[PDB]
Design a protein around this ligand. Structure first.
Ligand SMILES: O=S(=O)(c1ccccc1)N(Cc1ccc(-c2ccccc2)cc1)c1ccc(C(O)(C(F)(F)F)C(F)(F)F)cc1
Length: 275
């Protein structure tokens, strides 16, 4: 059964989530849009992470639709980067507000707050993006914006070869509750193994408590044979998200080295000093 401390932990996380997650993206406005050496550039073909179609549904009922180009050996592969940087920044701001509303996070030293945010911001963004992911249509439904995955030669199986997309499809298939998503966010945020964390023992004990609460929540609310080992499946998903995070940071820094695009907040979270 759930203890009162566990019920209070979940409510504190759930309240932080509702206050800082605009599930309709209604305040994402004024964002940029796409217009109307050599082995560096060769691995920079990783920008096929910008093979997304874009839809904007106006309040008037009008619809704008963007189909991205194909790589012709030029600068056209960067066309989606400024927009995606603006969405990541909007999402990052939501993640930061989330952490700052949590009492457990507020009580940590400010240096550890920064170290935990720098270490986990991307992971918490993906966890939030999973909740608006449509696994049937392969689209992230962000209110009036929709990000559709463009048809690949292999179709769904080829898309599931990119770890990020496989994570989204696999995590979506677990059909988690809002409470389980927010506990995943807590476990990812309070990670003692992050570079620069001073209060390593406090952060570790907090992470352990969030994990017991998730384990207990699943045990109390999910008796069905389909949810056997669910707690352990979630923990492995978070271990994989850390590897995707590390892979994504390297991919991002390589693009930034060639074609700078990162916003000030992204630079801060990724350590880019401006010099
Ligand atoms: O998490 S997302 O849904 C998201 C995040 C932020 C805003 C909106 C959506 N996502 C989808 C996403 C992820 C991977 C792929 C893909 C597909 C085929 C082959 C290889 C890969 C397609 C879409 C994603 C994540 C990271 C990035 C970036 O940081 C950016 F563009 F923002 F700079 C990167 F490209 F630099 F990596 C861009 C999209």
């Amino acid at each position: 059964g759930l203890t009162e401390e566990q019920r209070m932990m979940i409510r504190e996380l759930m309240d932080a989530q509702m206050k800082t997650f605009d599930t309709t993206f209604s305040h994402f406005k004024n964002f940029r849009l796409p217009g109307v050496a050599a082995k560096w550039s060769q691995v920079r073909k990783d920008l096929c992470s910008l093979k997304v179609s874009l839809q904007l549904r106006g309040e008037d009922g009008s619809v704008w639709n963007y189909k991205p180009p194909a790589d012709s050996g030029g600068k056209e592969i960067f066309s989606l980067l400024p927009h995606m940087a603006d969405m990541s920044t909007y999402m990052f701001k939501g993640i930061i507000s989330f952490a700052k509303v949590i009492s457990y996070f507020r009580d940590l030293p400010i240096e550890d707050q920064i170290s935990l945010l720098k270490g986990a911001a991307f992971e918490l963004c993906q966890l939030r993006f999973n909740t608006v992911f449509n696994a049937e249509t392969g689209t992230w439904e962000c209110g009036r914006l929709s990000y559709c995955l463009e048809d690949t030669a292999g179709g769904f199986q080829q898309l599931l070869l990119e770890p990020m997309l496989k994570f989204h499809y696999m995590l979506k298939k677990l059909q988690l509750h809002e409470e389980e998503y927010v506990l995943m966010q807590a476990i990812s945020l309070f990670s003692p193994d992050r570079p620069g964390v001073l209060q390593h023992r406090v952060v570790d004990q907090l992470q352990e408590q969030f994990a017991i609460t998730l384990k207990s929540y699943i045990e109390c609310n999910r008796p069905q044979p389909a949810h056997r080992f669910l707690f352990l499946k979630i923990m492995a998903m978070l271990t994989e998200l850390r590897s995707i995070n590390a892979q994504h940071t390297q991919r991002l820094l390589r693009i930034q080295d060639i074609h700078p695009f990162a916003t000030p907040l992204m630079q801060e979270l990724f350590g880019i000093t401006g010099s």
